[PDB]
Amino acid sequence: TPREVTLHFLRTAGHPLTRWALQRQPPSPKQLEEEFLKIPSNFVSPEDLDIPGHASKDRYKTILPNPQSRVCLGRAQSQEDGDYINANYIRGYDGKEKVYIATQGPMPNTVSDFWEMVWQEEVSLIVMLTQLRECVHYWPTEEETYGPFQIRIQDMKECPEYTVRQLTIQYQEERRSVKHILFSAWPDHQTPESAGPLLRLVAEVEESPETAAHPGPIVVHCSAGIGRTGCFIATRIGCQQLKARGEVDILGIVCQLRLDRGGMIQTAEQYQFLHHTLALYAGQLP
Numbered sequence: 360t361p362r363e364v365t366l367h368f369l370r371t372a373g374h375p376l377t378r379w380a381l382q383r384q385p386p387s388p389k390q391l392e393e394e395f396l397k398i399p400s401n402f403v404s405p406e407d408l409d410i411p412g413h414a415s416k417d418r419y420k421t422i423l424p425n426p427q428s429r430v431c432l433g434r435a436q437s438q439e440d441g442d443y444i445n446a447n448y449i450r451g452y453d454g455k456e457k458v459y460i461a462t463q464g465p466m467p468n469t470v471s472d473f474w475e476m477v478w479q480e481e482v483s484l485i486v487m488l489t490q491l492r493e494c495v496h497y498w499p500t501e502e503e504t505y506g507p508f509q510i511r512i513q514d515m516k517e518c519p520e521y522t523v524r525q526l527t528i529q530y531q532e533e534r535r536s537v538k539h540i541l542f543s544a545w546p547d548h549q550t551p552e553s554a555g556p557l558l559r560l561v562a563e564v565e566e567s568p569e570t571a572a573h574p575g576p577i578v579v580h581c582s583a584g585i586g587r588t589g590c591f592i593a594t595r596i597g598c599q600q601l602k603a604r605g606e607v608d609i610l611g612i613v614c615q616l617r618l619d620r621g622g623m624i625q626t627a628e629q630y631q632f633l634h635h636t637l638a639l640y641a642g643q644l645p
Contacts, residue, residue, distance in 0.1 A: 366618075374386070374394065375606055376607055378605045381601075381641055391630060391631050395630040413443045415468065416468065417463070418464070423445065424444075424620065425619070428447040430444055430448060430460055436478060444475075448619065449592060450619055451592075464580050464584070470497045474508045480576055481575035482576060483536060484564065484567050484577045489542070489545065489581065490544060494582055507530055508530055510526055511527050512524055512525070521563065522543075542560050547587070549628070554635055561598055584620070585620065586622075589613070589616050589624040593616060593623070594633060594637070609637065
């Protein structure tokens with residue numbers, strides 16, 4: 360029962376850290392390495408997905424969306440011949456459902472699928488994590504059509520650590536705003552240069568105006584949709600926990616992310632960086 364073993368661990372593991380312990384007596388680097396190694400991947404095998412031809416829509420053969428939380432494309436706006444995108448709904452703070460969608464960066468052949476997801480899920484914020492040297496330019500310079508959708512850029516603002524683009528997406532009579540944040544200087548399998556810029560990115564997300572009665576998920580993506588995406592989501596949830604409760608269970612956060620999409624947070628170094636980042640955020644709280 361390895362699957363039962365995996366699920367049991369992920370559903371029950373935890374290591375609560377008070378604000379004090381996080382700042383002043385955190386687990387040692389060796390303890391964090393051993394802890395990280397114990398967390399199961401919850402990767403799905405090709406056998407657990409019965410979606411013909413999905414492989415042409417995956418950037419990586421072994422990184423697949425867990426079927427239980429996979430975003431299914433209903434094709435309400437198109438005639439495309441299946442439902443597949445490599446993306447999962449991700450729970451947020453306190454287990455709130457569908458706070459995020461974690462997904463891979465679109466491939467040339469999945470750009471239309473990506474925008475179809477953005478429309479279907481009523482997404483108004485996209486967070487893109489990348490490095491300068493690296494993913495396709497799936498948004499236009501001025502205006503472009505992707506399948507049935509017209510996308511226009513209304514504004515572009517360069518901040519020290521990220522670029523904010525204000526886009527609109529239109530289908531027939533309806534046009535919606537979408538804020539797009541591109542955070543560069545985050546290399547694959549590595550951490551950001553320091554935590555400051557990451558926390559400013561999280562604040563930028565937080566301050567993003569919400570209009571909808573039932574806010575759609577925030578799309579977060581990077582090349583594979585698991586390492587950097589998981590670090591970003593875990594950071595935001597950890598900040599929310601610290602602010603609301605004055606403690607954070609980082610092991611628990613990572614376990615819950617893995618239930619939602621296998622493999623979230625790729626390296627022990629990234630896991631240790633989460634502890635560093637959150638210790639920094641803790642100092643900002645009253």
